[model samples]
Target chain A: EWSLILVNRQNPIPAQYDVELEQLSNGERIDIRISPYLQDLFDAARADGVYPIVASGYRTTEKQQEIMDEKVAEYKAKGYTSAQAKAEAETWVAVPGTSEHQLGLAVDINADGIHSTGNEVYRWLDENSYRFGFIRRYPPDKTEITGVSNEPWHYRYVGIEAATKIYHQGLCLEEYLNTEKLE
Target chain B: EWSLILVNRQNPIPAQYDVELEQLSNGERIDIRISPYLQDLFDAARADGVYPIVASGYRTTEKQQEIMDEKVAEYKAKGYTSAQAKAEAETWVAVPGTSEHQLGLAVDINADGIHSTGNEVYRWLDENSYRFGFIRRYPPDKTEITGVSNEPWHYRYVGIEAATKIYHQGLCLEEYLNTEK
Candidate 1:
């Protein structure tokens, strides 16, 4: 939802932004606009035994760059050269302004692993997240389109109507926005 | 699709609005954001024997006020009181600030009535406008909620996905955005 903003490698943050924050009980925060859906999603999943946790939410440009450094450094520590580490890190983390997380609409959802396994949490999300307007931002098969590998934990808020269409049509956000006509 | 923006009697324009308008060949205009969808809709409808003509699109505040005056004057021309005529006219026209036309996304559509009858045109629009992201804004029965009368020719651009949901669910934009939480 680039009306929900489509942020990916090809599309960087087009402009400066304003934001109001909503804080989750766990201290994780997201844009105020999406607070209701995010809370509802967590509450609904918890009732069904999926303890959805927000691993990450809004990220500053500094934090995104910092995340890139850690990933690159992690790779470098593995006996790889700087060139190889830089390439490897880019695969997992977006470079600063190019990140959806910077926009407050992208989130990393994970399970506590005690109440539920990652697969159990992710599976439930795949089946029902659209009802609450979240979608798997980077589908496992859409790496070619989204420029990121399968990030089951990552979800984006595209609004319910759009999320439902993308869910049922089996489309990533890029394809959903780009397609000229309804099928 | 209030993501489409919900401007009605109850809800006025929410903020200072910047407008970019896309001009139709007929000289009517609509919001630039909705340009592609509106053009695509008319083009698609014409291909299927429906020549949807824009009776009106964007309206300046003065124009909106002028339209209300004409309706009130028309009603008052009959043996009616000033209050009675104004009340009757409210059903037909929105007060200036509350009108959707000023936002440049709502249009009053009519058929040429020659190449295609008005009935022929409105019927096609009702059936297929959703495919192009337009919805019959004021449905025949949604008057209680929409604050306007059944205006079959008045359609709004709410985007394909929202309009699709509103169409199938039979919701006016007010109800569509209000409910479905």
Candidate 2:
């Protein structure tokens, strides 16, 4: 019954601003952060003509709140009830306390534009992401449990060796690491 | 501009049944699956007296379609225009092709009906989840870019080393793995 605090700006994880791209239409300057191990991979993707624009990389709780607040108002005005707005907002807004951007390991790429995660560039990213120690956070099919849609442009840096296993096995980070205990 | 498909019956992705007591509501059978690695972790959590329940696991395109259809109808009946309903439904339902459930690597865990990732039981799971190779998929602060709500109960299997790094660094799987290239 008690709500716990999720993630906050005060507790930001260490990260490296690996790549920088132009501003989004919303005028937010996008920066992509990642583990230092893949510095070469980041450049390789760029050299291969992937542009690899950083649509969104990391976010703090306050930043997430500001975005969610706008979405709440927009959805509510669009006819969603309070509960509906909250539920609906969850699809697009990371609730104040639960978000991954605070950790600075995830990056939203540009298949070309903002929210463009299914383009050919994204597909290339998906196919070769693991070579650089990255994997698509959500694939094109596991939305039910992941509670979100598939995003080809969205990649997570889980390290080279691990990313290889995940990609070879065609699994998500969630499924690849979670298991059931047998007594 | 294109739409994806979601169906419930017999999907292409692997679907494992949920029977863990800690993760389920009494007698509630849910469909969920994880990579072979995380399956070990989930089993370990169960052994440690942590009730990790999988609310909903892998889903096909049709199932998502059905949810979207229902959402559209609900929004429309509530006076939302077609466009409004279409946009509104996107918040909760994955639009057919854009779903993570198809990959069989994600699981939504409920520790004794609680959704706190920072709880003692969850902490134990967090600390040891990577031993079995699991990590929380989405933390509470990544909504803007991930386009989803923060779920503490949702743990993802990214492998032990990956999960370990992510947990130690306190980054979401997405953020933790978005490196290397």
What TM-score, to 2 decimals, does candidate 1 have?
A: 0.49
| Candidate 2 chain A, poorest ten consecutive residues by summed lDDT | A1-10
> For all the models shown, what interface RMSD does each have?
29.1, 17.4
Worst 10 residues of 1 chain A by lDDT: A20-29
lDDT of each: 0.79, 0.53
Tens-digit lDDT track for model 1 on B105-165?
7888876533565678889999998998889998879888876888888888888998898
Across A91-178, the per-residue lDDT of candidate 2 in tens digits comes to: 6656654555444556666543211223656767877878877777778677664555666656677767778887888776656664
- Per-candidate DockQ vs. reference: 0.01, 0.01
* lDDT per residue (tens digit) for residues B1-181 in model 2: 0001112222333354222222222212222333445557657776776655454455445544544665666777688987897777665555665555544445655543222222655577656776766665655677554455555655555566666776787765445435532
RMSD of 1: 23.3
Best by TM-score: 1
**TM-score of each model, paired residue for residue:** 0.49, 0.39
